[PDB]
Amino acid sequence: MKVPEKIPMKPLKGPLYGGYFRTWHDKTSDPAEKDKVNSMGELPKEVDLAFVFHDWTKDYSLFWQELATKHVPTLNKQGTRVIRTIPWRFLAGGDHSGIAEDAQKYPNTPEGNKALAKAIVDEYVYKYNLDGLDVMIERDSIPKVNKEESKEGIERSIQVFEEIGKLIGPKGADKSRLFIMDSTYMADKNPLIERGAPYIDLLLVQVYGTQGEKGGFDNANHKAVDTMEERWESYSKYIRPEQYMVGFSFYEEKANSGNLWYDVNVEDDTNPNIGSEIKGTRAERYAKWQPKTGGVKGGIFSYGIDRDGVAHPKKNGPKTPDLDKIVKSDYKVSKALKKVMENDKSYELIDQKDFPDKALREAVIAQVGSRRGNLERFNGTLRLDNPDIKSLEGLNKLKKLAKLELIGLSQITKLDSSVLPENIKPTKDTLVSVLETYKNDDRKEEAKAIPQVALTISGLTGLKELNLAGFDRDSLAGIDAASLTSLEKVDLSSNKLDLAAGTENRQILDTMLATVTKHGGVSEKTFVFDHQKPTGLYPDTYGTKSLQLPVANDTIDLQAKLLFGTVTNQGTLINSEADYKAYQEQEIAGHRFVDSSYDYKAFAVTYKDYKIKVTDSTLGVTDHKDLSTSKEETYKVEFFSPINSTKPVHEAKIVVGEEKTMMVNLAEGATIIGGDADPTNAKKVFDGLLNNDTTTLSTSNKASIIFELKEPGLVKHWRFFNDSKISKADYIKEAKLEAFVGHLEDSSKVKDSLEKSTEWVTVSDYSGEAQEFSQPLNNIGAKYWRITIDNKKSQYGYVSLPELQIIGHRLPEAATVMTTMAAAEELSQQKDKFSQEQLKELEVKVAALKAALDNKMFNADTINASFADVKAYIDK
Ligand SMILES: CC(=O)N[C@@H]1[C@@H](O)[C@H](O[C@@H]2O[C@H](CO[C@H]3O[C@H](CO)[C@@H](O)[C@H](O)[C@@H]3O[C@@H]3O[C@H](CO)[C@@H](O[C@@H]4O[C@H](CO)[C@H](O)[C@H](O)[C@H]4O)[C@H](O)[C@H]3NC(C)=O)[C@@H](O)[C@H](O[C@H]3O[C@H](CO)[C@@H](O)[C@H](O)[C@@H]3O[C@@H]3O[C@H](CO)[C@@H](O[C@@H]4O[C@H](CO[C@]5(C(=O)O)C[C@H](O)[C@@H](NC(C)=O)[C@H]([C@H](O)[C@H](O)CO)O5)[C@H](O)[C@H](O)[C@H]4O)[C@H](O)[C@H]3NC(C)=O)[C@@H]2O)[C@@H](CO)O[C@H]1O
Ligand SMILES: [Ca+2]
Numbered sequence: 001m002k003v004p005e006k007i008p009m010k011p012l013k014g015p016l017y018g019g020y021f022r023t024w025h026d027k028t029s030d031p032a033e034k035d036k037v038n039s040m041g042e043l044p045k046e047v048d049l050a051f052v053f054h055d056w057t058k059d060y061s062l063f064w065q066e067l068a069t070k071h072v073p074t075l076n077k078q079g080t081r082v083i084r085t086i087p088w089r090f091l092a093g094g095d096h097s098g099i100a101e102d103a104q105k106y107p108n109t110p111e112g113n114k115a116l117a118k119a120i121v122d123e124y125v126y127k128y129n130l131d132g133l134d135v136m137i138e139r140d141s142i143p144k145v146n147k148e149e150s151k152e153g154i155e156r157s158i159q160v161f162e163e164i165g166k167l168i169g170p171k172g173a174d175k176s177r178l179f180i181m182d183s184t185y186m187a188d189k190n191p192l193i194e195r196g197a198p199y200i201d202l203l204l205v206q207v208y209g210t211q212g213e214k215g216g217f218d219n220a221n222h223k224a225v226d227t228m229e230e231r232w233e234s235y236s237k238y239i240r241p242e243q244y245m246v247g248f249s250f251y252e253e254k255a256n257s258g259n260l261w262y263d264v265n266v267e268d269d270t271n272p273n274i275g276s277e278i279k280g281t282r283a284e285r286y287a288k289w290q291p292k293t294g295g296v297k298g299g300i301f302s303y304g305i306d307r308d309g310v311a312h313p314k315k316n317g318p319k320t321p322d323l324d325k326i327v328k329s330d331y332k333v334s335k336a337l338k339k340v341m342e343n344d345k346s347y348e349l350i351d352q353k354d355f356p357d358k359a360l361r362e363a364v365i366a367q368v369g370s371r372r373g374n375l376e377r378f379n380g381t382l383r384l385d386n387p388d389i390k391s392l393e394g395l396n397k398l399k400k401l402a403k404l405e406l407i408g409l410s411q412i413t414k415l416d417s418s419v420l421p422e423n424i425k426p427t428k429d430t431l432v433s434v435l436e437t438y439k440n441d442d443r444k445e446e447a448k449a450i451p452q453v454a455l456t457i458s459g460l461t462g463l464k465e466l467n468l469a470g471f472d473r474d475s476l477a478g479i480d481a482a483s484l485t486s487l488e489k490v491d492l493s494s495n496k497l498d499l500a501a502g503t504e505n506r507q508i509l510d511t512m513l514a515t516v517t518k519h520g521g522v523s524e525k526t527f528v529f530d531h532q533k534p535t536g537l538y539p540d541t542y543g544t545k546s547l548q549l550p551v552a553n554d555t556i557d558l559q560a561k562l563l564f565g566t567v568t569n570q571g572t573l574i575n576s577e578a579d580y581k582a583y584q585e586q587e588i589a590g591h592r593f594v595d596s597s598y599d600y601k602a603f604a605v606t607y608k609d610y611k612i613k614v615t616d617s618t619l620g621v622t623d624h625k626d627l628s629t630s631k632e633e634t635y636k637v638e639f640f641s642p643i644n645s646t647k648p649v650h651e652a653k654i655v656v657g658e659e660k661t662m663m664v665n666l667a668e669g670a671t672i673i674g675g676d677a678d679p680t681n682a683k684k685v686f687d688g689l690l691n692n693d694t695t696t697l698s699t700s701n702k703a704s705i706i707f708e709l710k711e712p713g714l715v716k717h718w719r720f721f722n723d724s725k726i727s728k729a730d731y732i733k734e735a736k737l738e739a740f741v742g743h744l745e746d747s748s749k750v751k752d753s754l755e756k757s758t759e760w761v762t763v764s765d766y767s768g769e770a771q772e773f774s775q776p777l778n779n780i781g782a783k784y785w786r787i788t789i790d791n792k793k794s795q796y797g798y799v800s801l802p803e804l805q806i807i808g809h810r811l812p813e814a815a816t817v818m819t820t821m822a823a824a825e826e827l828s829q830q831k832d833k834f835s836q837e838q839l840k841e842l843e844v845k846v847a848a849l850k851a852a853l854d855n856k857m858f859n860a861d862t863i864n865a866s867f868a869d870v871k872a873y874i875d876k
Pocket of ligand 2 (some may be wrong): 684685686688689691803
């Protein structure tokens with residue numbers, strides 16, 4: 001088989017029309033199968049990319065000889081690339097992977113992956129001298145081993161995908177061949193987009209049907225999911241807009257439910273040619289569709305292009321079998337969609353009518369895109385550093401630009417709304433979608449607000465006028481006023497500028513009064529900056545971090561004294577209605593700038609929906625704003641925003657009376673050793689989420705739990721809760737907390753079975769009806785604890801325990817400290833050992849240890865060091 005060499009072709013220029021041709025519908029596929037009458041080589045020149053879609057076709061067939069020798073030269077002459085399409089499995093190996101089936105020749109090694117990639121290109125691209133590769137990434141081609149999805153093969157396809165990219169495509173050694181990824185996944189559900197995007201020329205999305213157009217429907221929230229724009233926004237992170245092509249599908253003969261797409265016209269007996277019309281169909285909609293942000297798309301593609309013109313059977317109507325008959329295609333729908341995209345105004349080339357300055361036009365074209373549709377949609381940064389630009393005429397055609405940088409434009413002498421992007425001011429989206437939406441939602445969407453373009457002026461020596469009034473510019477940043485030397489008249493009114501103190505804007509403002517004082521022309525007409533409405537923001541940090549208060553029977557407002565204030569984007573802090581009144585009547589060059597109408601109510605932020613959490617040294621949590629100083633206590637105050645109920649915005653320390661050390665929850669994360677309760681829900685007692693995110697209970701009448709502390713230490717307090725007033729009269733009414741001191745009946749191997757029997761000590765015996773119970777404990781150093789609860793109900797009583805806290809100070813090896821102090825206090829008890837006086841050296845050193853253990857300011861060093869003191873004398 002003599003494969004002719006590639007003929008010259010023109011470069012690809014958008015918009016592009018692609019089409020998958022099914023090999024088993026070529027005449028040369030199966031000579032016996034005489035009902036197939038179409039040919040791949042008869043695709044019109046409107047087809048830019050012709051995808052070869054091989055399955056159900058013989059390997060020894062004459063179609064391959066026909067394609068390499070006739071179809072490829074024929075389509076290349078009219079400018080049509082012929083692309084070979086392979087499934088995702090071919091890049092991984094395993095079930096039905098083509099070349100990769102020979103694992104011995106191409107193993108899963110770094111050298112094997114490199115060699116497999118070359119074999120893939122040699123076999124699927126270079127063998128018949130095709131124009132590119134197209135890897136197909138969907139569930140229908142996911143790598144599998146023994147019919148189950150292979151997470152190991154998926155990883156290999158990523159490595160092979162890059163290795164293919166180093167051979168063909170935009171970053172490959174051979175850039176004459178395309179490398180394309182068609183897919184059904186959203187970019188986050190696509191394992192290969194993240195590393196494959198730099199290596200691919202184009203990217204196709206298989207958005208077929210009304211779900212492909214309108215997206216899926218979230219029946220819970222009555223909202224659309226995975227919409228067209230959402231799908232594009234996911235892939236817009238990895239590829240450019242001019243690489244994104246959407247796709248519809250024609251009617252496949254004898255297609256079953258789940259493969260009906262209705263992307264073309266539905267059949268009509270009164271028009272035997274309605275299928276070849278394209279008006280109002282999902283195919284034309286996709287042709288006319290453009291993303292709202294970033295730039296025009298690459299084009300559209302069609303699957304089953306051999307069935308062009310065939311009308312789609314009715315959804316629930318009587319069956320029509322003449323549509324399943326195979327006829328020769330004239331590809332009228334394919335040509336019509338090509339013309340619809342070419343004649344679309346969004347692809348009109350940018351010419352001198354838009355930007356008369358040729359130095360300006362070239363910069364825009366080389367940065368925004370050659371088409372007028374990119375002006376409405378470009379979403380990035382435009383940098384104009386070519387000094388030859390004489391006229392900025394036409395920058396108001398830029399609608400969604402994100403950053404504008406004017407660098408060293410000496411010949412520009414005026415800047416107003418007519419020579420700036422229209423989103424210099426707050427604007428809304430004016431583009432209308434052509435796709436259908438969900439009739440099962442409410443009325444159609446409202447205009448989305450377009451973010452304002454960032455303006456950077458620097459080096460504009462010749463600039464004489466700078467008019468920016470009424471634009472709601474948030475600050476004056478990016479303006480290098482020191483280089484704007486020829487300015488004469490400037491307007492900055494009706495903005496949001498905090499022109500005060502030594503603010504950035506106020507320093508630009510004042511550097512700019514200079515260049516129109518050196519320039520003696522200054523009137524009340526030439527420099528206007530009044531009617532300023534700076535937006536008020538929540539302060540990033542708050543001032544008061546600590547408060548030492550005396551003990552006295554008086555409540556204080558915690559939020560009032562700790563969390564207040566409004567901060568501008570330049571640094572000014574306003575706390576009261578008076579601070580804003582002193583800020584409001586602040587003059588610059590004998591003239592106020594803040595608007596009169598803009599009052600304190602409209603500027604300062606509000607703390608109506610803010611929440612407070614006050615935790616004391618015993619981990620007792622309260623949510624009330626007021627705080628009674630009637631008890632000596634050290635607290636911990638946190639404030640939370642409505643937008644975030646987990647991360648505090650300001651944290652503080654309140655010390656009433658003398659400062660007590662804050663105790664921690666020693667049982668948080670406890671390991672369940674044994675007991676009667678369901679182990680799944682026993683862990684929820686010690687997990688930490690304050691009384692249980694709607695989880696469940698322990699046993700059916702009366703539960704016991706035996707647990708081990710993560711890090712043992714000094715235990716001073718304990719606390720347990722009932723359910724969140726979710727229940728009433730079902731509360732735990734009898735509780736028994738126990739500590740373990742029976743050393744250990746050995747069996748370190750089997751803790752639990754002897755934990756279940758040995759000698760424990762009752763430390764608390766609760767009996768009540770409260771929702772929360774807390775009680776001090778007398779310095780226990782145990783590491784194994786037992787809790788027993790009972791709600792005084794039927795044998796099917798279903799007792800619950802959402803959370804239980806063992807509260808104290810983290811003291812490593814506190815068990816040995818308590819046992820030694822017990823061994824010393826009970827040994828100086830017996831004054832008959834020796835003289836009472838010589839062992840007073842131990843009697844005074846034992847109350848130093850005890851006072852250190854009971855001090856409000858728990859000092860770990862003072863206890864560990866003083867522990868060794870009594871340890872020496874018991875050693876004697
Ligand atoms: C961008 C895009 O669109 N992407 C996808 C796209 O793929 C979707 O299009 C579909 O693609 C189908 C091909 O997918 C394969 O290739 C993909 C890429 O290569 C890949 O991603 C897929 O995963 C899939 O891969 C193949 O997977 C199979 C399964 O594992 C592999 O098969 C195995 O192969 C090994 C050898 O290696 C062994 O032989 C195993 O035994 C075998 O199982 C295969 O290797 C994989 N391929 C590769 C390359 O790895 C495509 O087929 C779909 O098109 C069909 O359906 C439409 C309608 O929906 C129809 O219009 C099409 O013409 C086509 O219909 C088939 O036509 C065949 C050609 O004639 C025909 O095959 C012959 O049938 C004969 C008739 O036989 C009987 C019988 O003997 O029992 C006769 C009975 O009377 C009849 N009963 C009836 C009619 O009631 C039954 C029927 O067949 C019955 O329905 C049983 O189900 O059959 C005879 O048997 C001949 O011997 C035989 O050769 C087929 O029978 C029909 N099939 C049907 C269902 O009609 C489709 O386009 C696209 C769609 O939206 O979008 C994305 O998903
Ligand atoms: Ca809990």
